[PDB]
């Protein structure tokens, strides 16, 4: 409930939505960036009354650099998982598909954030039919002319009010002091600050983060108070607010300063993968820690400082509470840009400006880090060359093929390249000079034809992370990854057939921690003997090769003492019944996360999982577990999160003793579940619960469980209210 | 000498060039389009005094849609034939290469036609160094601000004057009446017209063509006189002059109207290949002739009407006088556009306008013929679909690769496609749905990976012309081209291994006329037995397989009675001496054109060629003939043109009886020629003569021959003055 002073505005907006015309209706929210337009939209999205009243709730991100085809793909992905048929149809075809998808449903609302030009609104409006079902469009805009120019915009342009003072002091106190009370010698400074921010929440949260970072001293509070007083916030000039961000930026440590500045190289509206980005922090040497925690731990700590300062906003978190997807505010992105080019020339972006001509070698040679986001193919066709370029950064929501003749240009022009992520570029093959980059550390790309990883990859002695994505069924690795001592991580989407190591000095790879998806045949004794420090393991392929009762290779997994994350993917031609678990003591004594996919195991097998006393997060995906009768056997003494998706389970019996400490519980696509155990509502730690494609009997059992737990909350000191998801509410 | 009234302007421009500053100097020529800027530039280029004074003379075409990399490639192609090393270097690298290439030479001039914006001039000027050698730049522009903005443009902007009336009447009379005298009842109309064109040569030539097309009657002359009087030519509004072109356009026949309008679909500044374009018409059914001449003959007649009306201007002609490269004036191109979209909606062009968004299906479905010239890859990535599209037209000076996943989009979106020329698009493979186009007639594309022509190509029963270009050494054709009765032409750049026909109805392909270079092993008896009407033959590969004395296959060529054009390319691993011709009577009795490449034959072999009494044009390319002593044996009773390039010939003896009727004579890269026969100057028909990379002894022999022939011209009635090329004059 981190929303202060928006209750009246949200209530009046909701009143506008539920009332008004009975046909199509669009409400525009205009305001100076950072004032709370998207935050208010998110509050409206999560409000219970509107969600109950609206059958379908879609969140859409537009941004300035919107792609209509990409946007239509994004909307289509929210309806049908089988997206292979929609990749070929032209844009109006997916527009009609969206039209009929929302036609099949009931009353719906569409949320369009950060629309910059009226022509974009006109081009996207064609996908929303007028079915006289009181469908609503929550449009957010920076300019009132966008709403004014539309004849169909019958609703008056709602100018969202700026934050009131009563909201100010309370908001800033909640942000910076949390549950603490401000000392008297800082209270007047806080009030003066709140009056001096001119009710702009982004400025308030950024100065709160700055105050947290340095210390809660009266002198520093007076300094920031006079600084914000020296910067009057004009209602028509947002750039001065960037100066306030400067008052935060100077307070960060030099390496942390640098990583925050590098965080701005990403495109606006881009949902950053957390794991990818921590790798960018590590590969570039930005993360330096002379302490007991690992470098990845230090990078996670830095991300935690970023989020708690409200500099980087997290949109989706992992099931266990970790950060999954983070992004930067568009105003903060513009400030980071302005700093990057006009102030400290750390890195530069190459964009198709009004001149429509790309920079030549003379200007490019002065760059140190590049970031090409659109029209990359033309730029690489120009064949640039940078002798002082240390990085190549490029993310796009669309995949761009790699011209073969143009392939050798990138390595030849950048011999001093260190990191090179082209995950939006589909490499067709490997060039010889690509193999000459001895200074490379991070390489990640996609391919649709590469089957054999060549031997010469072993001669890159400075690579730290290697990420490969492909649509091929099986991937063969011929390069000697075992002698690559500095290699730390691997991530693959296909079945990776690692070479069988040969036994010959400290050849043991103590730095290798995570190695993503590996074919079952490579999970041998020698492979795990060379990496005792492995923590995350992933197996992809015919799991029957792993888990035959007579010659199961999981005995080798027993000797891996440092393992905590295991992933198994079943790609066998036949995935029928007959699979069973080995004795429970075979597993590592300190494993934490295991995920079973397409295993087709009997329910009783969790008894093996019942022996592990430290299991806390478990995920079942794509027919991990099934069986008509599920009886809870054994006690999961430390289970916190269990995640089951698309199982034909019918009946489940459970008790509080079986799962004494569960916190997160998820069922998805359970088309045959009869009832959820009532006694689960008797567990105090049971907090969050969700349904998807469940039976009506499951729905009424869920409602009864919610009522019982709410009554228990009325009985005991259950501070954390129960969370139930009525999805879909149709 | 078709230049009237420009003698004074050309003389003063030449005086400016030879005089002025001793360093870099740029003369700009500004004027309303069609006034004669490029024509005056061409006259200056071909003037003898400037060519003698200037060591290096380069012609450069810029146009509005100029590409700096393409332009630099074009300039580099004029210096070194080995262009494989220059394809990889970045733009400034070829700029420096051009800098040193002109540095090695002496005083030079660079001609830049049709420069539209000053920034283009600034970006191209960096390739021209200041060596204090009085180098000159003939720049042609439409706006004086382009010259004014340049600080280095010390020379005053020369505003070229409009043609005077005395030149006018003479110019129009030379254009329309040639050597005839205007009747008195049309002379006053001609004078009134010439005064009413306001001295604009393009208008004069177009109305002369219109008058020629309809008839030289007094009433029609009065009609065109009042029409041009009704259209006053404003000096600042060129669009009204387009109306005058209308007075010509309405006078053409409907099919000829249509083909002229289709001629405008090509990009401005594009040098049209004549053969391709007659193929494009013959495929679209535009050429209809109910007469004895072939359809190709009718198309050539139409092109002749186009050129003699000055609607289409020819830049380079074939050695025998035929049209090789033709183009349209930029003002005429704009008029053709205006007519195409705003008037008769015959065809439309898809371009990246200020909106920066490509048309959708709704507008595209109303189109009948398309023409995409730039940013084609984005358009095909959009995946357009046209149910009423009958043609797909795309030429570019650069090669664009074909995305595999995007490959199927083109055929699926255009099932009613008839012609499809993507010769600027590099196809990587064949898609199955591409093979579903049963309405296709003309297909032409380039590839760097296609080795096997698939069988299903035989199921396209409506194909008339098939053109394939590839860099592969050998091309295999598996499709049954023999049962393709409507197929008329084939053109390949690689060795084409045709399938061996099997003997089984009129299966004989009487419509097949030309079939490009074909691998030697396919020149069998059965192949030539199925196409008795063949006229142009081409063989590419190991010619030793064709021409072994014991088992030569040219006996089969004997039975081909309709053959007139033969091409042979030697791609054998060893091309050493030992090759010899068969007896002369083996050849068809009516052959006209033969070309020998890399044959390595003895000189005496022309005795066989001496037997053919109707040989008129012969070309020797890439070591066709060699030998220290060349003695002329036999009499070429009808030889007109002989063409020899890069031979190590030393001594040649010839007489007038050997070549009694030669007209065009060419020697290129003769690094060892001792002397040219003096008696060749005694031949009356000897008119044109050229040298390239010749010896100094060859140069002085050439000068003596020129002096002797000029003295003979002073003796006899040699109306056609002798033409000698001082090339290079360094
Ligand atoms: N009621 C509120 N309580 C706390 N923070 C808020 C509130 N409204 C806005 N904010 C903060 O203001 C910032 C700007 O939010 P957002 O609406 O996403 O951008 P914009 O206002 O430009 O659309 C957010 O980071 C958010 O944390
Ligand atoms: N002195 C001349 N004699 C005959 N025709 C001319 C003369 N000068 C120009 N023309 C004609 O005028 C037309 C325009 O010529 P050009 O110079 O190529 O275009 P622009 O004047 O727009 O540069 C040409 O087709 C040419 O035939």
TrEMBL record, chains A, B:
Residues 7-181 form the NB-ARC domain. Residues 704-713 have a biased composition (Basic and acidic residues). GO terms for biological process: defense response to other organism; defense response to virus. ATP binds at residues 4, 34, 36-39, 142. Residues 266-335 form the Disease resistance protein winged helix domain. Residues 388-668 form the Disease resistance R13L4/SHOC-2-like LRR domain. Keywords: ATP-binding, Leucine-rich repeat, Nucleotide-binding, Plant defense, Repeat. Residues 702-721 are annotated as: Disordered. The keyword 4Fe-4S does not apply. GO terms for molecular function: ADP binding; ATP binding. ADP binds at residues 2, 4, 34, 36-39, 329. The keyword Ubl conjugation does not apply. Belongs to the disease resistance NB-LRR family. This is NRC2a. The chain holds residues 152 to 885 of 886 of the full protein.
């Amino acid at each position: 409930d981190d929303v202060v002073g928006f209750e009246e505005e949200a209530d009046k907006v909701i009143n506008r939505l539920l009332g008004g015309s009975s046909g199509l209706e669009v409400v525009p929210v205009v305001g100076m960036p950072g004032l709370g337009k998207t935050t208010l939209a998110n509050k409206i999205y999560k409000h219970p009354d509107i969600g109950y009243q609206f059958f379908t709730r879609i969140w859409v991100y537009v941004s300035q650099s919107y792609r209509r085809r990409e946007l239509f793909l994004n909307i289509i992905s929210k309806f049908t998982r089988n997206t292979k048929q929609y990749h070929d149809m032209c844009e109006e075809d997916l527009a009609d598909e969206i039209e009929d998808f929302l036609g099949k449903g009931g009353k719906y609302l569409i949320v369009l954030d950060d629309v910059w030009s009226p022509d974009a609104w006109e081009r996207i409006r064609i996908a929303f039919p007028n079915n006289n079902k009181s469908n609503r469009i929550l449009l957010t805009t920076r300019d009132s002319k966008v709403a004014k120019q539309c004849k169909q915009c019958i609703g008056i342009p709602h100018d969202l009010k700026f934050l009131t003072e009563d909201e100010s002091w309370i908001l800033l106190e909640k942000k910076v002091f949390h549950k603490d009370k401000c000392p008297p010698e800082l209270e007047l400074s806080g009030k003066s600050i709140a009056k001096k921010c001119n009710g702009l929440p982004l400025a308030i949260v950024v100065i709160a983060g700055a105050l947290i970072g340095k210390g809660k001293t009266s002198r520093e509070w007076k300094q920031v108070d006079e600084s914000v007083g020296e910067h009057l916030i004009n209602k028509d000039q947002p750039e001065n607010c960037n100066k306030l961000v400067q008052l935060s930026y100077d307070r960060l440590s030099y390496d942390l300063k640098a990583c925050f500045l590098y965080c701005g190289a990403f495109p606006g509206g881009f949902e950053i993968p957390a794991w990818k980005l921590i790798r960018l922090w590590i590969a570039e040497g930005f993360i330096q820690y002379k302490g007991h925690l690992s470098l990845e731990c230090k990078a996670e700590d830095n991300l935690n400082d970023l989020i708690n300062r409200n500099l980087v906003m997290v949109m989706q978190r992992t099931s266990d509470g970790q950060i999954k997807t983070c992004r930067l505010h568009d105003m903060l992105h513009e400030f980071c840009r302005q700093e990057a080019m006009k102030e400290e020339n750390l890195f530069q972006e190459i964009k198709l400006g009004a001149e429509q001509y790309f920079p030549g070698k003379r200007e490019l040679a002065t760059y140190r880090r590049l970031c090409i986001h659109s029209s990359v193919l033309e730029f690489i066709s120009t064949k640039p060359s940078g002798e002082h370029v240390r990085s190549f950064l490029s993310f796009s929501l669309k995949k761009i093929e790699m011209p073969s003749v143009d392939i050798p240009t990138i390595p030849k022009g950048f011999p001093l390249l260190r990191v090179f992520d082209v995950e939006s570029i589909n490499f067709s093959r490997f060039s010889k000079e690509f193999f000459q980059l001895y200074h490379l550390r991070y390489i990640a790309f996609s391919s649709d034809t590469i089957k054999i990883i060549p031997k010469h990859i072993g001669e890159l002695w400075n690579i730290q992370t290697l990420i490969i994505n492909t649509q091929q069924r099986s991937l063969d690795i011929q390069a000697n990854i075992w002698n690559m001592e500095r290699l730390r991580h691997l991530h693959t989407n296909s079945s990776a057939k690692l070479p069988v190591p040969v036994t010959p000095v400290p050849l043991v790879n103590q730095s290798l921690q995570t190695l993503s998806t590996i074919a079952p045949e490579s999970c041998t004794e020698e492979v795990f003997a060379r990496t005792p420090n492995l923590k995350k393991l992933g197996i992809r392929g015919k799991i029957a090769v792993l888990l035959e009762p007579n010659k199961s290779l999981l005995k080798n997994v027993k000797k891996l003492e440092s393992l905590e994350n295991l992933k198994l993917i079943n790609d066998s031609s036949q995935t029928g019944k007959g699979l069973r678990l080995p004795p429970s003591y075979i597993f590592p004594t300190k494993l934490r996360k295991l995920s079973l996919v397409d295993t087709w195991l009997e329910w009783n097998d969790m008894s093996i999982l019942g022996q592990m006393e430290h299991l806390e997060v478990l995920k079942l995906k794509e027919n991990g577990f099934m069986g008509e009768c599920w009886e809870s056997v054994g006690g999961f003494c430390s289970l916190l999160v269990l995640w089951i998706e698309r199982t034909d389970l019918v009946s489940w019996k459970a008790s509080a003793d079986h799962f004494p400490r569960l916190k997160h519980l998820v069922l998805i696509c359970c088309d045959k579940l009869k009832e959820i155990p009532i006694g689960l509502a008797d567990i105090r730690s049971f907090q969050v619960m969700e349904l998807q494609n469940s039976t009506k009997t499951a729905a009424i059992s869920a409602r009864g469980i919610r009522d019982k737990k709410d009554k228990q909350t009325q009985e005991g000191t259950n501070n954390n209210g129960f969370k139930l998801s009525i999805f879909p509410p149709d």
